[PDB]
């Protein structure tokens, strides 16, 4: 795997999406990650693969806004081979997107350090899949509607912001 820079990751990601158009899938995983005395630096690890070549990057609160503007655009642009214009969540151990989102959100807030957010895009099949799990409870949401790409991206991206957000702890 290869730890990359913000922009080196985004270019490498784009290449993954490009190589899996005739076949394959692109998986993306997100997760919280852990002289003069500075309060530290909250982060999230971002990994992606096409089954052969594995890449990763570490985003912090100092660059989520700038990163996310590029990252959000790249997801929407590259995940474009969907039903022009199947759908539905699962509570494993929701039909509506609404029920899925809420459930996945509580699962995240429960224990931020143990939860993994997964994205799987299969261009050839014309389907996108998002999974939020803590390895015990699993919540997935499958779609083939090009209209669901936007909200699935915005959501996945908001979780990223929660992972990175800094909290004024009070010593």
Curated annotation (Swiss-Prot):
Principal location listed in the UniProt entry: cytoplasm
Swiss-Prot/TrEMBL GO biological process terms: SRP-dependent cotranslational protein targeting to membrane
Pfam families: SRP14 (PF02290)
Keywords, comma-separated and alphabetical: Cytoplasm, Phosphoprotein, Ribonucleoprotein, RNA-binding, Signal recognition particle
GO MF assignments: 7S RNA binding; endoplasmic reticulum signal peptide binding
Keyword Ribonucleoprotein among record annotations: yes
Record's subcellular location: Cytoplasm
Listed GO CC annotations: nucleus; signal recognition particle, endoplasmic reticulum targeting
Family recorded in the similarity comment: Belongs to the SRP14 family.
Stated role: Component of the signal recognition particle (SRP) complex, a ribonucleoprotein complex that mediates the cotranslational targeting of secretory and membrane proteins to the endoplasmic reticulum (ER). SRP9 together with SRP14 and the Alu portion of the SRP RNA, constitutes the elongation arrest domain of SRP. The complex of SRP9 and SRP14 is required for SRP RNA binding.
Oligomer and partners: Heterodimer with SRP9; binds RNA as heterodimer. Component of a signal recognition particle (SRP) complex that consists of a 7SL RNA molecule of 300 nucleotides and six protein subunits: SRP72, SRP68, SRP54, SRP19, SRP14 and SRP9.
Protein name as catalogued: Signal recognition particle 14 kDa protein
């Amino acid at each position: 795997m290869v730890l990359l820079e913000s922009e080196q990751f985004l270019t490498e990601l784009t290449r993954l999406f490009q190589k899996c158009r005739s076949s394959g899938s692109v998986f993306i995983t997100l997760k919280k990650y852990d002289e003069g005395l500075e309060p530290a630096e909250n982060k999230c690890l971002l990994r992606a693969t096409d089954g052969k070549r594995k890449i990763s990057t570490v985003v912090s609160s100092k660059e989520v806004n700038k990163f996310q503007m590029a990252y959000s655009n790249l997801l929407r642009a590259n995940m474009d081979g969907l039903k022009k214009r199947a759908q539905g969540g699962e509570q494993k151990l929701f039909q509506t997107w609404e029920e899925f989102s809420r459930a996945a959100e509580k699962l995240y807030l429960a224990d931020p350090m143990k939860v993994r957010v997964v994205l799987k895009y299969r261009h050839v099949d014309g389907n996108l899949c998002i999974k939020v799990t803590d390895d015990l409870v699993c919540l997935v949401y499958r779609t083939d509607q090009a209209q669901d790409v936007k909200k699935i991206e915005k959501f996945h991206s908001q979780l990223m912001r929660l992972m990175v957000a800094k909290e004024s702890r009070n010593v």
